């Protein structure tokens, strides 16, 4: 991770199935844990654009599935407010399969890339096609 990340509305809690946006062959990502979650009583950990969470490949290749391993959310359904004041929401909850270092396992992505995710992860922005 490079640079601090501004707080934005959470809309991807644990127990969520989400679309996998890269070309690595994975289709569905299942959220199991979220990094950087404090000790909040009876609170479901949640994810947002640019946040790295433990995801499991529900649908895709048998080989990369069975790896609870970090995924960066690139598109979020829930509306969130950018610090400029405008509100954004994407139709689909899209994530990218990434190693702990910060490099995407896949070679290319599909769909628009949230700018907050792009600035946080330079490798994702490098591999991004449309940063909106």
């Amino acid at each position: 991770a490079s640079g601090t990340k501004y707080r934005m509305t959470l809309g991807l809690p644990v127990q969520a199935i989400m679309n996998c946006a890269d070309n690595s062959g994975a289709k569905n990502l299942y959220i199991v844990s979220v990094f950087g979650t404090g000790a909040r009583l009876n609170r479901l950990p949640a994810a947002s654009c640019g946040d790295m969470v433990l995801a499991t490949v529900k649908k895709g290749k048998p080989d990369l599935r069975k790896k609870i391993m970090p995924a960066i959310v690139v598109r979020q359904r829930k509306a969130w407010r950018r610090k400029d004041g405008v509100y954004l929401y994407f139709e689909d909850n899209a994530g990218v399969i990434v190693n702990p270092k910060g490099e995407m396992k896949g070679s290319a992505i599909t769909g628009p890339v949230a700018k907050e995710c792009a600035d946080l992860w330079p490798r994702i922005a490098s591999n991004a096609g449309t940063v909106v």
Partner: protein, 225 residues
């Protein structure tokens, strides 16, 4: 070739853009990165302390050569005007209303010949030809459509994936009318465009780039003298 680093990130190509007539660096971050570029290019070409779309990824968001520069449509008007004031008059600046805002990621262009995304729009290609005044080829690098990120292209040298075949390597070099090398940067970082920025007389690599890689890019680029 010089080893530079933006904060703790070795992908200086992402956070900065380098051309043969100007230099682009991020805004509001560490002043050391801007000073590193200034020490090597301050007395040669202007260096612009700018951001695009309120982002620090201007290197991979903007595509351009020594004559002209392109920014995605999401670039703010205040950012667009700030670029024009900083950049000299002989450097054209143009907005691109493209489905893929990552112009730097999808187009790898030198001063004379440009390789663009296979899905780039016809209007975008026309604008590239008008402003960049370069021949536009619609192909792919190592089977990956992000030519601007997976290929580091300069006037006297080019770098691509190490996984490309020899015949693909030779075909690309012949099309690009430039010597080309299949290699890696930043100790295994195969995204050369993200980890390397090179003009026609100087190259800048990440701080994690190995000495062997540094020797290789210097040799192919013939910038030792």
């Amino acid at each position: 070739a010089l080893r530079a680093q933006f904060e703790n990130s070795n992908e200086i190509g992402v956070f900065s853009n380098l051309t043969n007539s100007y230099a682009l660096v991020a805004l509001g971050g560490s002043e050391n990165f801007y000073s590193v570029f200034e020490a090597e290019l301050g007395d040669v070409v202007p260096v612009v302390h700018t951001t695009i779309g309120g982002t620090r990824i201007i290197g991979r968001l903007t595509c351009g050569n020594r004559k002209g520069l392109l920014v995605p449509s999401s670039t703010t008007d205040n950012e667009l005007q700030h670029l024009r004031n900083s950049l000299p008059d002989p450097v054209k600046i143009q907005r691109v209303d493209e489905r893929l805002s990552a112009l730097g990621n999808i187009v790898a262009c030198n001063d004379y010949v440009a390789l663009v995304h296979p899905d780039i729009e016809r209007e975008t290609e026309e604008i590239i030809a008008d402003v960049l005044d370069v021949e536009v080829f619609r192909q792919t690098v190592a089977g990956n459509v992000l030519t601007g990120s997976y290929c580091a292209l300069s006037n006297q040298g080019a770098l691509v994936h190490p996984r490309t075949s020899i015949q693909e390597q030779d075909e690309l070099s012949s099309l690009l009318q430039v010597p080309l090398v299949a290699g890696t940067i930043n100790r295994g970082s195969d995204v050369i465009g993200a980890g390397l920025v090179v003009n026609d007389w100087c190259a800048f690599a990440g701080l994690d780039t190995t000495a062997t890689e540094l020797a290789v890019c210097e040799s192919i680029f013939k910038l030792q003298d």
